[PDB]
Enzyme design. Sequence first.
Site, PDB file in Angstrom:
ATOM      1  N   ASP A 151       3.126 -10.611   2.297  1.00 45.17           N
ATOM      2  CA  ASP A 151       2.893 -10.144   3.659  1.00 45.17           C
ATOM      3  C   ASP A 151       2.666 -11.265   4.661  1.00 45.17           C
ATOM      4  O   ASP A 151       1.564 -11.398   5.204  1.00 45.17           O
ATOM      5  CB  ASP A 151       1.733  -9.164   3.751  1.00 45.17           C
ATOM      6  CG  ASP A 151       1.798  -8.361   5.027  1.00 45.17           C
ATOM      7  OD1 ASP A 151       2.801  -7.644   5.215  1.00 45.17           O
ATOM      8  OD2 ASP A 151       0.876  -8.475   5.863  1.00 45.17           O
ATOM      9  N   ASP A 178      -1.250  -1.722  -5.001  1.00 43.13           N
ATOM     10  CA  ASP A 178      -0.671  -0.451  -5.427  1.00 43.13           C
ATOM     11  C   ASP A 178      -1.505   0.746  -4.984  1.00 43.13           C
ATOM     12  O   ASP A 178      -0.958   1.836  -4.781  1.00 43.13           O
ATOM     13  CB  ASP A 178      -0.505  -0.447  -6.950  1.00 43.13           C
ATOM     14  CG  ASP A 178       0.596  -1.388  -7.426  1.00 43.13           C
ATOM     15  OD1 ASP A 178       1.641  -0.892  -7.896  1.00 43.13           O
ATOM     16  OD2 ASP A 178       0.426  -2.621  -7.328  1.00 43.13           O
TER      17      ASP A 178
END
Lengths: 311, 276
Positions: A151, A178
């Site tokens: 990211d 997740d």
Amino acid sequence: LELDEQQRKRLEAFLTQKQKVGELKDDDFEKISELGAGNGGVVFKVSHKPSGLVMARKLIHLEIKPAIRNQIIRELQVLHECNSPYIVGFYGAFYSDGEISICMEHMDGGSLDQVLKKAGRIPEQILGKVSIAVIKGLTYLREKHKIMHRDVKPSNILVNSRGEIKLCDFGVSGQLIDSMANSFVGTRSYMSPERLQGTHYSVQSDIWSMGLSLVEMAVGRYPIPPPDAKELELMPMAIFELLDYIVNEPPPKLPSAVFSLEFQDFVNKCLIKNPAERADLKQLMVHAFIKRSDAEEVDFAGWLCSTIGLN
Amino acid sequence: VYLQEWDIPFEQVELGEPIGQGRWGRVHRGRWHGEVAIRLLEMDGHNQDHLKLFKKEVMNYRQTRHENVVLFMGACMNPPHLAIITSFCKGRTLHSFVRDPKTSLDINKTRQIAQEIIKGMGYLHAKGIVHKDLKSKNVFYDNGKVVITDFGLFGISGVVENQLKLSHDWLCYLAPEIVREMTPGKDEDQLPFSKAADVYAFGTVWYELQARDWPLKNQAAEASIWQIGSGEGMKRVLTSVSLGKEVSEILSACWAFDLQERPSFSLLMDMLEKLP
Ligand SMILES: Nc1ncnc2c1ncn2[C@@H]1O[C@H](COP(=O)(O)OP(=O)(O)NP(=O)(O)O)[C@@H](O)[C@H]1O
Ligand SMILES: Nc1ncnc2c1ncn2[C@@H]1O[C@H](COP(=O)(O)OP(=O)(O)NP(=O)(O)O)[C@@H](O)[C@H]1O
Ligand SMILES: O=C(c1ccc(F)c(F)c1Nc1ccc(I)cc1F)N1CC(O)([C@@H]2CCCCN2)C1
Ligand SMILES: [Mg+2]
Ligand SMILES: [Mg+2]
């Protein structure tokens, strides 16, 4: 390694003030002001009471089954081994009230997204230095702990008046990725075209993200869709058509009139759609633009504090 | 609705322990003597247009009764506070049911469960109610019997920034028409649910009956949005591991990129018949 000594003497200085703070818990802290919030949780400037230190606290709010909550905290504690002049100083991680908090360095100048909005545009002289910083951070991460960031964008690039650049919010824990981080989608996308189609990705995806981020900071505008002809000299779309653009259209490129070949070529190599042909980190480290900016003389701290108004 | 306007005789109803939260209020277990599920909602919207739609839909659900659809019992509205009361489903969600080791699914059991679900959806469609939220977690399996829950509920406008947060399990059940329209600041009520989107969601639950897992492994939601709304992801899953030709034919039909090429639920009953 290849750790300068100036750097090694400010790393030791912060690990040994680090053991002075010991452990912590919530009521040790006290608010200051609103740094901001997004894609998970609010972060606030805080003063720690046992050990006279000002920190930045990241709270994210996750009611889920406690088993994975403790798995998250133990995976997140690996931040204690992660210490580089290009990764924000980490202090501690703990669970409280079902709200995980991460305590890290406070960075005087905030994020290069914040820097950018006030600065309007970021010059090339200086984007050179941040580019070196990012490849160094990413190589440190891939070689020493074998993780990738997943990211990279300006709001996760942090600057201080002492003149350092470090990366925050990299994907160290898989469970936290997740269980929470995956579910958010913003108004912009920094994801590589091979991640968007769900194949196996690598740190190559981070190379793409870095390239897109450098374009945004260089021209002041989020680069896709490419600015229109009238908007370029001067310098309303839903998320799926953004993603379909990223996957099915040419990538951004810097304007040819303004920046050197070396910069234009650097970004062109970061933004190749096929991750196999995209430069890796070994190759980016020896690129002409890097060799130039590494050997240049820019005073970062000066530019930063006269950009935003610190001392 | 003051709850005495319903054909179910009502003296008193008591809240019991909660059994899960979500985007639409909190769902408690309760005692009507029978067990019931009680969903507590609150209406921010207040503009009497929202409550008008709520009243219309709750009396539309009154007209429903079918052994594969959960029994709608009552709804009362002391605005902003509202409550929806359905029959409580013993047994396990089909979601957690296919994911059990001890569970033994087979080419027969799967078709039977699927035909149950299709009958339920066919009734609901006949009376013109669109589910708008069919998924494995909203189907209950207790011994032989299969019951659909939580239908019609996405049409309402109660309390839920300019970002999005989308669970992965949900997006697997979403047709391309929908995920293309998702974007921050757009509410769920503005999305294009439909009968065809419902049969697409049936496609995903059938895949789950075959493979006992999601058709797309957990990943960043932006990735899922592109893969779902491009049709690419569904093209690649049909490639990647296959099941049987007649089995996979129904899957390819339900997931059809163009919604108009998707079969009706009546037709899907027949298709499930001409199998092993
Ligand atoms: N360690 C830090 N020091 C100073 N400011 C920070 C720090 N971490 C985050 N911020 C700022 O706090 C605000 C919100 O941070 P954050 O919760 O990470 O969301 P975000 O950075 O805006 N985007 P995202 O990383 O996707 O969540 C932004 O303005 C950041 O620049
Ligand atoms: N009639 C019912 N009988 C038994 N359990 C039910 C019934 N209705 C709902 N539930 C359960 O109660 C909980 C509340 O569901 P819900 O609030 O819809 O959460 P969700 O479906 O998992 N996500 P969301 O739809 O966004 O709220 C879930 O565990 C449901 O399976
Ligand atoms: O806070 C995080 C984050 C995500 C994954 C992870 F494993 C973490 F440890 C995270 N926090 C974190 C890690 C190292 C330091 I030093 C400081 C930290 F706060 N994230 C990812 C983030 O950047 C967002 C979340 C989801 C969407 C976009 N990225 C925010
Ligand atoms: Mg951040
Ligand atoms: Mg539900």
